[PDB]
């Protein structure tokens, strides 16, 4: 087990035992963010400036066992330097193209289900019909509209409940689920999510974005429904109007 091995190797030398046995567990939230770098005021300029550098991006060290140094023609693909305050390596943007060129392949049967809320849009657009164009006045009133269908009638509490029961099962803590709808959602995701290798933060994020409701403040002139709003730039204008029924 690499876990207990690396633990024992940490608490075998100095400088690392006192930090682990002095820092309580309600304090690691602060020292996780202890950085010596600053959030940047001008990102566009820095991107344009850094793109002409030899080694502009950073990768995990495992690269040294997954990607060569010099490719078929002889262009360097990663460097031998460590980043500022981390154990990550500094790599060139040709390594991304390489990985996409001659790299390890996997399966993609779960990527549709984890990102269902996007593929809904994708195969709802290619099943819709058009009509005439009415060039006339456009009178708009500003209202509050739900910009997401809001899968369930629930709020944040039971949302975290179902998400922790589906993603982090052995650490839900104390409580159990109560009603039928949350159990149904739970078990559906239980079955259809088995044997997934996507990062659990990504699964939790997609389930939050797929399961909770968001509302905004927008100018409307036609119909007030949720499937219409996502196509709003295209249906209404200030002088014209396109007709559309999504599928």
């Amino acid at each position: 087990m690499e876990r207990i091995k690396e633990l024992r190797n940490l608490m075998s030398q100095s400088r690392t035992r006192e930090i682990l046995t002095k820092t309580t567990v309600d304090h690691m939230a602060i020292i996780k963010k202890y950085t010596s770098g600053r959030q940047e005021k001008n990102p566009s300029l820095r991107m344009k400036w850094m793109m002409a550098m030899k080694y502009p991006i950073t990768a995990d060290k495992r690269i040294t066992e997954m990607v060569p140094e010099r490719n078929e023609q002889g262009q360097t693909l990663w460097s031998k330097m460590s980043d500022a305050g981390s154990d990550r390596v500094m790599v060139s943007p040709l390594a991304v193209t390489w990985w996409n060129r001659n790299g390890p392949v996997t399966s993609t049967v779960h990527y549709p289900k984890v990102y269902k809320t996007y593929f809904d849009k994708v195969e709802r657009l290619k099943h819709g019909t058009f009509g005439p164009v009415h060039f006339r006045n456009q009178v708009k009133i500003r209202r509050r509209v739900d910009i997401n269908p809001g899968h369930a009638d629930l709020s944040a509490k039971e949302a975290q409940d179902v998400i922790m029961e589906v993603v982090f099962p052995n650490e839900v803590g104390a409580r159990i689920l109560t009603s039928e709808s949350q159990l149904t959602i739970t078990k559906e995701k239980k079955e259809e999510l088995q044997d997934c290798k996507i990062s659990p933060l990504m699964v939790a994020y997609m389930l939050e974005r797929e399961l909770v409701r968001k509302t905004r403040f927008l100018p409307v002139a036609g119909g007030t429904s949720s499937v219409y709003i996502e196509v709003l730039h295209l249906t209404q204008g200030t002088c014209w109007e396109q007709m559309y029924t999504p599928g």
């Binding site: 309580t24 996409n100 392949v105």
Partner: protein, 736 residues
């Protein structure tokens, strides 16, 4: 013929072409060198705009301080600072009768926030002043330092995690004769005294503002420290709660919400009497807003707001005004001297500005230094009677709305009405009277009222028209709000996060400008083409059939050659563009899905590649942007985590310094907080709690796993031995 574009305004109304005025296709003004001069000018103007007050030397700090409260009323029309007490209190007491119960509900709303908030929430925000390092540091790397210095001298109460206890710690730090602090210069130890510590803890940092548009001269802004930030958080919470319940305010909302209220107030005063009345509209600004408005009035309005409330509530709510009214501002970086005859340049620090010979400065600097010199105390400068940017904004807006509320019909007593909307300095007013002798009376009432609380109305940037046309902030009203594409123009470009976020937020800003800012179809198509062109140029990702020699070229053509369907390769890989008006709300990988072959899908979305980096949940599919008018905002975008979701590199000019021990530390912290990730794989979604050490937990949740999955499901019994062996070994190595 001599072409002259301005003549267009002979046929086109101005508001229908105002986008042609903003010259926002060039670079904005910046600053060079120091800002010491601007800070000195600011201190001197603050002490000049009120000089008929009382001087006293504070007992604790020992600083000359002026109290410009209940001073003499002003005579001429210059910017005054002599605000009354009864005026403030009557404004508050009238605003509360206007909105019944607005204070009690807000205090109820804020008490829970007080009693449940934890300390970690102070790790969010901008740069903060660090008094251990005497510099500017991010929030977390300052909270850690102040906690390490508090608990290394006996002050241990914050361990309960509540911020209400770190507050008590900050306070009881003020009652000690001596304080040990260390310096990474090995290290060292130094002993700071009581009043030196006070002065070091009542200090703000100052520096010049950059990339601001619309002005010829440069200004200065301030930065608070660590000991004051909690109480500021709390009072801002209360003030925001109050502001979200007032019709006449516009601060805690966005662009679209404000325009609805503007139209609402305009047509409220539009039509209740059609012939026997007369309306006028005042557009303008306020002058020297954050040079007046001293804290000793914030104290009174807070004491009024928190009336008939628990006593700890008032005591926690009234500490920020107290440290503000006793503050001491830094000066900057110093000056640079040059000798033309021997080619020598040198830097002098702001600490020598109380003793240096004066034979080195020009006339302006001499007459600034010799007027600020009666206030210099150990680098700082006594600044009692004013505020400065980075301050209590919501409470200023509250006071202004209270001033506007005084102009109801049952208060003005004769005929006059005035309404409007305020958001800090900016205000828009509307006056009514059935005459032309009544408008001047109304305007005079308002103007003379705003002088009694310290709100000096500018008179060289304002005008007065008949109703139906105005300009609030940069919005222009001509029987309806005309669009202004030039303000949002400076965002149509690459943002600089990575190759995956740029494509999303580009099409997203195009879409959001079509929906509200009233852009057009042809305009959006041409914007699309230009944006794809500059994207392809910035990231070296031209099409895969061209001859443009760049460095992702030898490789991209390879991916171009061994490809069946070339309409699946993403634009980041040298492929086509299937975007249009209808396709504008759909992610890229979700739109080219059905057209890629399997090897490409696999290699691209391989969920074990070494470039993807997720850190927490508050920073997934979210990035900060820098607009043209306003502060930095947060933008949420729709992407799909793939190989093109990487992170750029970090600055490395810290190795050549003496504060290298700030890197060592963080590295170790990482190598620890990473392992806690894999013994507890749920801490980036939810925050972990307890008061036990990090190794007790990592050994408690290390024996269950050997007996429950690998020895209650029939997996090998020969690893269980050594697992328990090393667990016992570790729990011995801690010497306990």
């Amino acid at each position: 013929m001599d072409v002259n574009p301005t003549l267009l305004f002979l046929k086109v109304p101005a508001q229908n072409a105002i986008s042609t005025t903003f010259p926002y296709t060039g670079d904005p003004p910046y600053s060079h060198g120091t800002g010491t001069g601007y800070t000195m000018d600011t201190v001197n103007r603050t002490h000049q705009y009120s000089e008929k007050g009382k001087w006293t030397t504070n007992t604790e700090t020992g600083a000359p301080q002026l109290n410009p409260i209940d001073g003499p009323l002003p005579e001429d029309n210059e910017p005054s600072g002599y605000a009354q007490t009864d005026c403030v209190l009557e404004a508050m007491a009238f605003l509360e009768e206007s909105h019944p119960g607005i204070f009690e509900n807000s205090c109820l709303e804020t008490m829970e926030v007080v009693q449940q908030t934890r300390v970690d929430r102070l790790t969010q925000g901008r740069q903060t002043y660090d008094w251990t390092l005497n510099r500017n540091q991010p929030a977390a790397t300052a909270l850690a330092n102040t906690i390490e210095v508090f608990r290394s001298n006996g002050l241990t109460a914050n361990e309960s995690g509540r911020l209400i206890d770190f507050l008590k710690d900050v306070i009881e730090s003020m009652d000690k004769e001596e304080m040990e602090i260390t310096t990474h210069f090995g290290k060292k130890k130094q002993r700071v005294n009581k009043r030196s510590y006070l002065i070091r803890a009542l200090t703000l940092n100052t520096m010049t503002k950059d990339a601001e548009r619309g002005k010829l001269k440069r200004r200065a802004i301030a930065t608070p420290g660590m000991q004051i930030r909690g109480f500021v958080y709390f009072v801002e919470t209360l003030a925001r709660s109050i502001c979200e319940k007032l019709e006449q305010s516009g601060l805690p909302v966005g662009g679209n919400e404000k325009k609805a209220k503007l139209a609402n107030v305009v047509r409220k005063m539009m039509t209740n009497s059609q012939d026997t009345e007369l309306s006028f509209t005042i557009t303008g600004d306020n002058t020297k807003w954050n040079e007046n408005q001293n804290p000793r009035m914030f104290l009174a309005m807070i004491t009024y707001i928190t009336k008939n409330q628990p006593e700890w509530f008032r005591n926690i709510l009234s500490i920020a005004p107290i440290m503000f009214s006793n503050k001491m501002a830094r000066l900057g970086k110093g000056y640079m001297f040059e000798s033309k005859r021997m080619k020598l340049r040198t830097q002098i620090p702001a600490e020598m500005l109380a003793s240096i010979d004066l034979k080195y400065f020009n006339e302006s600097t001499r007459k600034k230094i010799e007027k600020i010199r009666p206030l210099l105390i150990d680098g700082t400068a006594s600044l009692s009677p004013g505020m400065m940017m980075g301050m209590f904004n919501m409470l200023s807006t509250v006071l202004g709305v209270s001033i506007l509320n005084l102009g109801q019909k049952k208060y003005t007593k004769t005929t006059y009405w005035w309404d409007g909307l305020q958001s800090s300095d900016d205000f828009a007013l509307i006056v009514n009277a059935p005459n032309h002798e009544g408008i001047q009376a109304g305007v005079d009432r308002f103007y003379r009222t705003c002088k009694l609380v310290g709100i000096n109305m500018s008179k060289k940037k304002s005008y007065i028209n008949r109703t139906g046309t105005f300009e609030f902030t940069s919005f222009f009203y001509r029987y309806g709000f005309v669009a202004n594409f030039s303000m949002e123009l400076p965002s149509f470009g690459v943002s600089g996060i990575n190759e995956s976020a740029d494509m999303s937020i580009g099409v997203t800003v195009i879409k959001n400008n079509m929906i509200n800012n009233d852009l057009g179809p042809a305009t959006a198509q041409m914007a699309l083409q230009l944006f794809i062109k500059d994207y392809r140029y910035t990231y070296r990702c031209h099409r895969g059939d061209t001859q443009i020699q760049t460095r992702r070229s030898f490789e991209l053509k390879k991916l171009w050659e061994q490809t069946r369907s070339k309409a699946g390769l993403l634009v980041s890989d040298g492929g086509p563009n299937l975007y249009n008006i209808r396709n504008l709300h759909i992610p890229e990988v979700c739109l080219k899905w059905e057209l890629m072959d399997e090897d490409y899908q696999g290699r691209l979305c391989n969920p074990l590649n070494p470039f993807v980096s997720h850190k927490e949940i508050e920073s997934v599919n979210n990035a900060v942007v820098m607009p043209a008018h306003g502060p930095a905002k947060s933008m949420e975008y729709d992407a799909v985590a793939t190989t093109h979701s990487w992170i750029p590199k970090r600055n490395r000019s810290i190795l050549n310094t003496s504060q290298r021990g700030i890197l060592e530390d963080e590295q170790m912290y990482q190598k620890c907080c990473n392992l806690f990730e894999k013994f507890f794989p749920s801490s980036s979604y939810r925050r972990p709690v307890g008061i036990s050490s990090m190794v007790e937990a990592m050994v408690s949740r290390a024996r269950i796993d050997a007996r429950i999955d690998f020895e209650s499901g029939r997996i090998k019994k020969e690893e269980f031995s050594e697992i328990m062996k090393i667990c016992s070994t570790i729990e011995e190595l801690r010497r306990q």
